[PDB]
Amino acid sequence: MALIMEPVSKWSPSQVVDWMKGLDDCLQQYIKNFEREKISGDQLLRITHQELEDLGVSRIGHQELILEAVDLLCALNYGLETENLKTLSHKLNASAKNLQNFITGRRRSGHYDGRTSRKLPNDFLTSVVDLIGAAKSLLAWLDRSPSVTRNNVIQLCLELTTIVQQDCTVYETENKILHVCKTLSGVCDHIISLSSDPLVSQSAHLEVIQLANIKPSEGLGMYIKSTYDGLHVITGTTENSPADRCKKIHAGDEVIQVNHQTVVGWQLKNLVNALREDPSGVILTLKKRPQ
Partner 1 sequence: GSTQQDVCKWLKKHCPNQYQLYSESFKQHDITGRALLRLTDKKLERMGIAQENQRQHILQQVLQLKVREEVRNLQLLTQNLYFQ
Q: Which residues bind partner 1 (CB under 8 A)?
A: 26, 49, 58-62, 64-65, 68, 122, 125-126, 128-129, 132, 136, 139, 151, 154, 157-158, 161, 164-165, 219-226, 228, 235, 268, 272, 275-276
Shortest Å distance, C-beta 198 to partner 1: 27
Please, what is the minimum distance in Å from the beta carbon of residue 189 to partner 1? 21
| Identity of the residue, 164 or 283, whose beta carbon is nearer to partner 1 in the bound complex | 164
Residue number with CB closer to partner 1 (1 or 125): 125
CB of 19 to partner 1, least distance (A): 18
CA distance 108 to 111: 9
13 vs 47 by CB, closer to partner 1 = 47
Instruction: Report the DSSP pairing between strands 232-237 and 261-262.
Output: unpaired
Judged by beta carbon, residue 200 or residue 272, the one nearer partner 1 is: 272
- Nearest approach, Cβ of residue 14 and partner 1 (Å): 27
Question: Residue 260 CB, nearest distance to partner 1 (Å)?
Answer: 18
Nearest Cα to Cα of residue 164 among 124, 117, 105: 124
Please report how close the Cβ of residue 49 comes to partner 1 at its closest, in angstroms.
Answer: 8
- Give the DSSP letter string of the chain: -TTTS--GGG--HHHHHHHHTTS-GGGGGGHHHHHHTT--HHHHTT--HHHHHHTT--SHHHHHHHHHHHHHHHIIIIITTT-BHHHHHHHHHHHHHHHHHHHHHHHHSTT--TTT-----HHHHHHHHHHHHHHHHHHHHHHT---HHHHHHHHHHHHHHHHHHS---HHHHHHHHHHHHHHHHHHHHHHHHTS-TTGGG-B-EEEEEEEE-SSTT----EEEEE-TTS-EEEEEE-TTSHHHHTS---TT-EEEEETTEE-TT--HHHHHHHHHH-TTEEEEEEEE---
Question: Residue 158 Cβ, how far from partner 1 at the closest point, in Å?
Answer: 5
CB closer to partner 1 out of 6 and 223: 223
Measured from the CB atom, the residue of 4 and 158 that comes closer to partner 1 is: 158
**Closer of 176 and 205 to partner 1 (Cβ):** 176
